[PDB]
Design an enzyme around this catalytic site. Structure first.
Site, PDB file in Angstrom:
ATOM      1  N   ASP A  34       0.574  -1.442   0.412  1.00 24.78           N
ATOM      2  CA  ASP A  34       0.160  -0.222   0.025  1.00 24.78           C
ATOM      3  C   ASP A  34       0.266   1.130   0.220  1.00 24.78           C
ATOM      4  O   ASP A  34       0.552   2.256   0.777  1.00 24.78           O
ATOM      5  CB  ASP A  34      -0.792  -0.504   0.956  1.00 24.78           C
ATOM      6  CG  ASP A  34      -2.165   1.472   1.179  1.00 24.78           C
ATOM      7  OD1 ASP A  34      -2.229   1.090  -0.021  1.00 24.78           O
ATOM      8  OD2 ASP A  34      -2.642   1.163   1.722  1.00 24.78           O
ATOM      9  N   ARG A  41      -0.163   8.582   1.664  1.00 25.78           N
ATOM     10  CA  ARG A  41      -0.175   9.031   2.885  1.00 25.78           C
ATOM     11  C   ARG A  41       0.561   7.990   3.619  1.00 25.78           C
ATOM     12  O   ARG A  41       0.595   7.992   4.727  1.00 25.78           O
ATOM     13  CB  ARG A  41      -1.779   8.802   2.752  1.00 25.78           C
ATOM     14  CG  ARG A  41      -2.054   6.945   2.815  1.00 25.78           C
ATOM     15  N   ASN A  42       1.176   7.512   2.909  1.00 26.84           N
ATOM     16  CA  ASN A  42       2.271   6.019   3.958  1.00 26.84           C
ATOM     17  C   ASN A  42       3.391   6.648   3.710  1.00 26.84           C
ATOM     18  O   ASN A  42       4.717   5.909   3.907  1.00 26.84           O
ATOM     19  CB  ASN A  42       1.524   4.945   3.626  1.00 26.84           C
ATOM     20  CG  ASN A  42       0.651   4.440   4.029  1.00 26.84           C
ATOM     21  OD1 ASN A  42       0.221   4.468   4.667  1.00 26.84           O
ATOM     22  ND2 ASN A  42      -0.657   3.341   2.906  1.00 26.84           N
ATOM     23  N   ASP A  79       3.395   2.124   7.718  1.00 26.69           N
ATOM     24  CA  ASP A  79       3.167   0.718   7.630  1.00 26.69           C
ATOM     25  C   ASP A  79       3.751   0.339   6.421  1.00 26.69           C
ATOM     26  O   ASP A  79       2.737  -0.458   5.554  1.00 26.69           O
ATOM     27  CB  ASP A  79       1.995   1.428   7.525  1.00 26.69           C
ATOM     28  CG  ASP A  79       0.885   2.300   8.687  1.00 26.69           C
ATOM     29  OD1 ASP A  79       1.981   2.640   9.647  1.00 26.69           O
ATOM     30  OD2 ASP A  79      -0.074   2.630   8.399  1.00 26.69           O
TER      31      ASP A  79
HETATM   32  C1  LIG Z   1       1.747  12.430  12.200  1.00 30.69           C
HETATM   33  N1  LIG Z   1       2.869  12.133  13.039  1.00 30.69           N
HETATM   34  C2  LIG Z   1       3.288  10.505  12.898  1.00 30.69           C
HETATM   35  N2  LIG Z   1       4.362  10.400  13.137  1.00 30.69           N
HETATM   36  C3  LIG Z   1       4.679   8.995  13.592  1.00 30.69           C
HETATM   37  C4  LIG Z   1       3.709   8.385  13.711  1.00 30.69           C
HETATM   38  C5  LIG Z   1       2.713   8.323  12.301  1.00 30.69           C
HETATM   39  N3  LIG Z   1       2.351   9.559  12.560  1.00 30.69           N
HETATM   40  N4  LIG Z   1       1.397   7.594  12.676  1.00 30.69           N
HETATM   41  C6  LIG Z   1       0.449   7.713  11.896  1.00 30.69           C
HETATM   42  C7  LIG Z   1      -0.547   9.138  13.277  1.00 30.69           C
HETATM   43  C8  LIG Z   1      -1.572  10.147  12.089  1.00 30.69           C
HETATM   44  N5  LIG Z   1      -1.284  10.202  10.515  1.00 30.69           N
HETATM   45  C9  LIG Z   1      -1.152  10.068   9.984  1.00 30.69           C
HETATM   46  O1  LIG Z   1      -0.477  10.545   8.605  1.00 30.69           O
HETATM   47  C10 LIG Z   1      -2.500  11.466   9.989  1.00 30.69           C
HETATM   48  C11 LIG Z   1      -2.912  12.657   8.767  1.00 30.69           C
HETATM   49  C12 LIG Z   1      -4.339  13.439   9.740  1.00 30.69           C
HETATM   50  N6  LIG Z   1      -3.991  14.819   9.117  1.00 30.69           N
HETATM   51  C13 LIG Z   1      -5.001  15.707  10.229  1.00 30.69           C
HETATM   52  C14 LIG Z   1      -3.072  14.280  10.332  1.00 30.69           C
HETATM   53  C15 LIG Z   1       0.305   8.889  10.984  1.00 30.69           C
HETATM   54  C16 LIG Z   1       1.394   6.161  12.650  1.00 30.69           C
HETATM   55  O2  LIG Z   1       1.046   5.912  12.280  1.00 30.69           O
HETATM   56  N7  LIG Z   1       2.789   5.554  12.869  1.00 30.69           N
HETATM   57  C17 LIG Z   1       3.554   4.476  12.729  1.00 30.69           C
HETATM   58  C18 LIG Z   1       3.625   3.545  13.441  1.00 30.69           C
HETATM   59 CL1  LIG Z   1       2.905   4.179  15.520  1.00 30.69          CL
HETATM   60  C19 LIG Z   1       3.489   2.652  13.913  1.00 30.69           C
HETATM   61  O3  LIG Z   1       3.398   1.613  15.031  1.00 30.69           O
HETATM   62  C20 LIG Z   1       4.534   0.453  15.274  1.00 30.69           C
HETATM   63  C21 LIG Z   1       4.441   2.073  13.274  1.00 30.69           C
HETATM   64  C22 LIG Z   1       4.403   3.039  11.482  1.00 30.69           C
HETATM   65  O4  LIG Z   1       4.871   1.928  10.233  1.00 30.69           O
HETATM   66  C23 LIG Z   1       5.376   0.794  10.167  1.00 30.69           C
HETATM   67  C24 LIG Z   1       3.921   4.112  11.758  1.00 30.69           C
HETATM   68 CL2  LIG Z   1       3.947   4.673  10.449  1.00 30.69          CL
HETATM   69  C25 LIG Z   1       4.013   6.725  13.420  1.00 30.69           C
END
Ligand SMILES: CNc1ncc2c(n1)N([C@H]1CCN(C(=O)/C=C/CN(C)C)C1)C(=O)N(c1c(Cl)c(OC)cc(OC)c1Cl)C2
Length: 276
Positions: free
Chosen positions: A151, A155-156, A169
């Site tokens: 995916d 967005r990712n 992700d």
């Molecule tokens: C926003 N800054 C941010 N920084 C780090 C992360 C992270 N977000 N999140 C999600 C949380 C919400 N995210 C967005 O893109 C939200 C968009 C909506 N707008 C309003 C901000 C990404 C995640 O899901 N991240 C995440 C987390 Cl928490 C993981 O936990 C195992 C594993 C991951 O990749 C395999 C990822 Cl990417 C960590």
């Protein structure tokens, strides 16, 4: 419950949970991630199960963690930093990206008619290619670890305070990023990821544009099957459009590898004007 792993374990009280980031993930401050700098606080993202979560939610959360343990570190992915697994709810601790996902990041940097700005300094030509390069470097690493994303999309990808691009992700309407063969035959490969990367390039040079505008989902296969590809974004070089097109080769064996894309992007970056 779940077995302890001291390579990753952080005591629960080393974490100060802060604001929600998105659903579930919270910003937090971790005390003493580095055993050698034990009085420093680092900002981190923490993923935990929602209050209404099923056992498949838990087991998926565990598999994500486990998978991230095996993949190893790379500057252009979101890296595992730690976990709290014993004293109560499972917490998975990963790197924080203060500037959010790449789609929002780009949209916020549009010039103020046919793609309005839904909120920053515009991105130069070189910055956009450099963003592509970084994403490709991250994908190159994951592919070298035999990790198929499935995916990949803007967005990712998340963006740090220092504008480092990090694939998100990789440990798990999205049909618009899927290779024909993924859609039709559910055959997922590095080559299907390369397809998705070409859609991601289109996203970059449309500054977070929506792919296949006005095309309903249920017609997309037939169209792709018939040779339909997206048109060049207005502000994209012919060369970068050919790359997109190559990524979208109908025969998957004929798509470039991420190794190749990295080399091509490395050179294009070097040749792209900072002044644009
Ligand atoms: C926003 N800054 C941010 N920084 C780090 C992360 C992270 N977000 N999140 C999600 C949380 C919400 N995210 C967005 O893109 C939200 C968009 C909506 N707008 C309003 C901000 C990404 C995640 O899901 N991240 C995440 C987390 Cl928490 C993981 O936990 C195992 C594993 C991951 O990749 C395999 C990822 Cl990417 C960590």
């Amino acid at each position: 419950e779940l077995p302890e792993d001291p390579r990753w374990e952080l005591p629960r009280d080393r974490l100060v949970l802060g604001k929600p980031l998105g659903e579930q993930v919270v910003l937090a401050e971790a005390i003493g991630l580095d055993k050698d700098k034990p009085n420093r606080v680092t900002k981190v993202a923490v993923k935990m199960l929602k209050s209404d979560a099923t056992e498949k939610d838990l087991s998926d959360l565990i598999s994500e963690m486990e998978m991230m343990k095996m993949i190893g570190k790379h500057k252009n992915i979101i890296n595992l930093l730690g976990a709290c697994t014993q004293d109560g709810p499972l917490y998975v601790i990963v790197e924080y990206a203060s500037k959010g996902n790449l789609r929002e990041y780009l949209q916020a940097r549009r010039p103020p008619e046919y793609s309005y700005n839904p909120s920053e300094e515009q991105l130069s030509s070189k910055d956009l290619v450099s963003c592509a390069y970084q994403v490709a470097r991250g994908m190159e690493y994951l592919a070298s670890k035999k990790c198929i994303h499935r995916d990949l999309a803007a967005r990712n990808v998340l963006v740090t305070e220092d504008n480092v691009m990090k694939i998100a992700d990789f440990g798990l309407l999205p049909v618009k990023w899927m290779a024909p063969e993924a859609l039709f035959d559910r055959i997922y490969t590095h080559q299907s990821d390369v397809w998705s990367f070409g859609v991601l390039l289109w996203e970059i040079f449309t500054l977070g544009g929506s792919p296949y505008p006005g095309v309903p989902v249920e017609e997309l296969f037939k169209l792709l099957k018939e040779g339909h590809r997206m048109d060049k974004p207005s502000n994209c070089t012919n060369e970068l459009y050919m790359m997109m097109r190559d990524c979208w080769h109908a025969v998957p064996s004929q798509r470039p590898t991420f190794k190749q894309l990295v080399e091509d992007l490395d050179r294009i970056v070097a040749l792209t004007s900072n002044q644009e």
